[PDB]
Amino acid sequence: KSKAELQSEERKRIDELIESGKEEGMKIDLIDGKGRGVIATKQFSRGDFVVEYHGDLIEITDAKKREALYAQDPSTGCYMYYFQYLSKTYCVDATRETNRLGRLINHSKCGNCQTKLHDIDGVPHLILIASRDIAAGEELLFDYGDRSKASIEAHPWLKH
């Protein structure tokens, strides 16, 4: 197959999985020092779609409104995922508890998933792709990407 053909076939697999919301090969576990995490129950191969980071897709005005409200309640966790799309700031706000697993995946700078922006006919999606082969039983991890001094002071696990 040509690159274009392989890319088309990959886009097709990804679009189908985004559509179905199917989240196979994963389960929730308690991970020491992290709260809940998501662990592989099957081997994933490098390049495989893992999961969508699924939640409320919102723009910047609403994101700030929600942040200011979440900041007032210390029991509320951190599930807001910011990105740039077509020169604007967007956020997948996964604060609401649902059965979707992307929102539960923990942080490492040296993890096994990489987030990508995936556009379907003008609708942006954040998806996690395996950055290497992932063993059954190991925790899914990606780089949260917040390197700010303000965050790292309060959340030192962001440093590694």
Partner: peptide, 8 residues
Amino acid sequence: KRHRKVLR
């Protein structure tokens, strides 16, 4: 003190 998740 909150942190974010941010695409890079």
